[PDB]
Design a protein around this ligand. Structure first.
Ligand code: CL
Ligand code: CL
Ligand code: CL
Ligand code: CL
Ligand code: CL
Ligand code: CL
Ligand code: CL
Ligand code: CL
Lengths: 497, 497
């Protein structure tokens, strides 16, 4: 920091409620401000739209050295810096940045941090230099020149419990959030669609608007609509929050196998006599934490640890259970390969961070134990790594895409995957849970049940030509090695939540 | 109230904690006290163990008229009045009732209000007459001379909920209380068994003991034991409360068909992998309020009202559901009758307060609707009224006794009864709930399941010779009229809770 060099500080006064701290900008590396110095009614040539960049810790630019000529000077700052400021300042009026604000062109494309930030105009009023004996600073207070729309759609936290009301352990709240969300300006049309900023942490949408604007914003979500009347609520530097149908709420639910699972992540009791078919994407088929490093923590030699647990790494919040798709089709899995996915995998740098898809040649578990483990999510990630290398369009990827297209998985889940042979075998028990707990629900929300006499694909590999395939009796599932990749068997997809 | 007649008031100072108000006696109609008047070191012949009886509002006896001779007189009172008080008072010592207390014989037979009250010795100290100008009163403060043991065994309130944790409506708390309760003095033997007073309102046992007594009291309950060391805790006019294994506690439970039901009224989730067989008496087979005036409140002509609802009248707290017995046997129901129970019933004064047992000749409901109603509890009470009149030992009463002997029903339930044909038909649905929800539980706690091909007795009468009998397919129950009372069919008992 140059001797006699003026230090720059920038503070956002924040966007406050039209009716707390409000929305205060903290700034980030790369943000730029412009600085002006006005002396005796004229901008100083040396400090005329001078840019300063935030590096994550402080504001840097060309040093401004203190001089006695800076006594009585009015300093002004604005964000975001504009290369062209000709005619954007006013020396006569009482608002130096009045033309910048008047001509500020705001669009409805604000869906990412950069698209929003570049439109969030902030300015200071006349600021004095503080200091003496070579230690000087400029500390600006910035105010937002636009207005802000905040939308809070309805959401539901589920506290999943056992039959005694004891909450199951989790990493973060499980929240069902609105789906098929679209916002429109004044009327619903493809050309009037607007793109607000989605705050995933607060679960709310934000949109900068010109002060005194009066448009209706139409929101579509789930299967309904709302009208957000912004007229008279668009004050400069202030926000209006629209809470739609109660906003956030919390419920408790005894999570059980057979419960109905929906596109927004909501769950309905499997005892429901008339379940809604709309947006139903599957049935809860297993309750508990399905991470292999949790399930198999006490297995001899600890073959599953946090280091090689892809599910724990990619979706640490999915500790409640598994869902089976209403989706079902018959088809091929992949072409017959020269080199198995297992054999390819063992030649890569991924052997410490993933588990092989093989049920048969695993280095840590024998061919009796490995096909019984819950590893479908792992297997999907290993198959994605294989795809990234060879770009072979396996038929299983097309069925996965089709399941996702017809029954979109919630963003809070793993997404759909072909279950491992272990996950499929666990669908059946000695009390015929497949027919009694699953098919009795499937028939209420779908025209297809899980045929107990059918053969099901797993994502567990036998060799270069075969997958493990699962069959059932009325008392057990059985993982067999005869699943020739080019044969036709039945698909059911799973997701973790 | 006689002019110049002294008014008597009696107040118990109460039994207080050895370590609130404590246990304060309020007195009841028929209670008697004895009164003494001591003048110049001698008992007055006119007021020597004079009895006074409480009538529910006031104390009455032979009137005591005020006289100047009563100035300076010491009055004493004790409870309960004894016809013989010779040598039971002390004029020399500072405690007038010291010999009464010293010779007081206390037994361990205190199981009813009268057996307890007759042993609860209470006395006053010297009391002065209050008043002037013909208005006088004697207001005694009585203190308990014995000590008191209070035992609080463990109990569990169940707040039964649906899958969303919403409490089901109820009239009073549902509480599982200890069973097979027995107390013994010093050691366990048939001859050392003691009978304390059971306070059903507070769910606790009380036993008067001599002050400074030191016996261990051994309590047996459920399948365990406790030792109550009374040594050093038996102070005159004070109680010691022993809280066994935490005493009263509250839990919440999602009540479902298939849940395991126990002898103490406790319920275990039907999802339990290893249910306890010990004290299991049945399976929850229906959830909800089973009172016919509630279930059928909207039926045309309102055939079921509070006036003719025997279940609501006798067990108003049984609004949670029904349980089916683990018990099952085959046998006859009754002899063939000349006059049906229905035909007998219609000639009685009970036709407005009960529903007929007939499924076929009901005056308000036709023969298609009447056999589908839940009326087994009603039917048991009508059959008891028939037994009270004719004293015929029907075989169904012997099977009921046998079920109760092997699987005792909790005191908070209806007790076991033969289900109506309507209750049996509701055990099966289109998703084969009989085999999937009931038999899968029965096989874990019993060696017998409900055979879907068997024929079951109901308590619904067809005519003088036949009962309705229920058969099942994999999709429905069917109530048939071919149940000749002297034929052999299968019994399953139900209870309401
Ligand atoms: Cl920010
Ligand atoms: Cl909210
Ligand atoms: Cl089979
Ligand atoms: Cl297997
Ligand atoms: Cl009392
Ligand atoms: Cl307690
Ligand atoms: Cl059938
Ligand atoms: Cl029928």
């Amino acid at each position: 920091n140059v001797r006699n060099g003026i230090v720059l500080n920038v503070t956002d006064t924040g966007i406050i409620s039209n009716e707390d701290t409000g929305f205060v900008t903290t700034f980030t590396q790369g943000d730029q401000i412009g600085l002006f110095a006005v002396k005796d009614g004229a901008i100083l040539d040396e400090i005329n739209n001078m840019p300063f960049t935030f590096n994550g810790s402080s504001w840097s630019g060309k040093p401004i050295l203190y001089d006695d000529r800076l006594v009585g000077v009015n300093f002004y700052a604005y964000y975001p810096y504009q290369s062209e400021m000709t005619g954007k300042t006013d020396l006569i009026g009482d608002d130096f940045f009045a033309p910048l604000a008047a001509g500020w062109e705001l669009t409805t494309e604000q869906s990412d941090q950069k698209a929003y930030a570049k439109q969030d105009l902030m300015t200071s009023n006349a600021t004095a230099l503080i200091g003496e004996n070579g230690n000087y600073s400029l500390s600006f207070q910035l105010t937002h020149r636009m207005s802000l729309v905040v939308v809070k759609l309805p959401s539901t936290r589920y506290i999943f419990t056992d039959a005694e009301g004891v909450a199951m352990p989790e990493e973060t709240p499980y929240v069902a959030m609105s789906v098929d969300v679209a916002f429109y300006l004044d009327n619903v049309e493809e050309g009037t669609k607007i793109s607000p900023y989605y705050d995933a942490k607060k679960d709310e949408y934000r949109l900068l608007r010109k002060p005194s604007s009066e448009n209706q914003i139409i929101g579509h979500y789930n299967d309904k609509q709302c009208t957000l009347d912004t007229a008279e609520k668009m004050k400069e530097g202030k926000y209006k929050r629209f809470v739609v149908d109660g906003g956030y709420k919390e419920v408790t639910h005894h999570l059980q196998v057979g419960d109905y699972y929906y596109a927004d992540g909501s769950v309905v009791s499997g005892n429901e006599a008339e379940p809604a078919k709309d947006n139903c994407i599957g049935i809860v088929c297993w309750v508990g934490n399905p991470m292999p490093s949790v399930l198999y923590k006490d297995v001899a030699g600890t073959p599953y640890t946090a280091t090689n647990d892809a599910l724990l790494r990619s979706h640490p919040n999915c500790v409640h259970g598994l869902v089976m798709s209403l989706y079902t089709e018959t088809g091929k899995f992949s072409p017959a390969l020269t080199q198995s996915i297992h054999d390819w995998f063992m030649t890569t740098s991924f052997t410490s961070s993933y588990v092989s898809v093989t049920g048969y040649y695993d280095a840590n578990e024998n061919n009796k134990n490995k096909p019984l483990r819950f590893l479908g999510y792992n297997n999907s990630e290993v198959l994605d790594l294989y795809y990234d290398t060879f770009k072979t369009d396996f038929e299983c990827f097309q069925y996965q895409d089709d399941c996702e297209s017809s029954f979109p998985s919630p963003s809070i889940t793993t997404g759909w995957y072909v279950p491992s042979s272990g996950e499929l075998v666990a669908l059946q028990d000695k009390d015929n849970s497949l027919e009694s707990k699953l098919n009795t629900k499937l028939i209420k929300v779908s025209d297809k049940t899980m045929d107990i006499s059918a053969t099901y694909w797993s994502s567990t590999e036998r060799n270069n030509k075969n997958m493990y395939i699962v069959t059932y009796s009325k008392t057990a599932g059985s993982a067999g090695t005869g699943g020739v990749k080019t044969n036709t068997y039945t698909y059911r997809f799973f997701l973790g939540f």
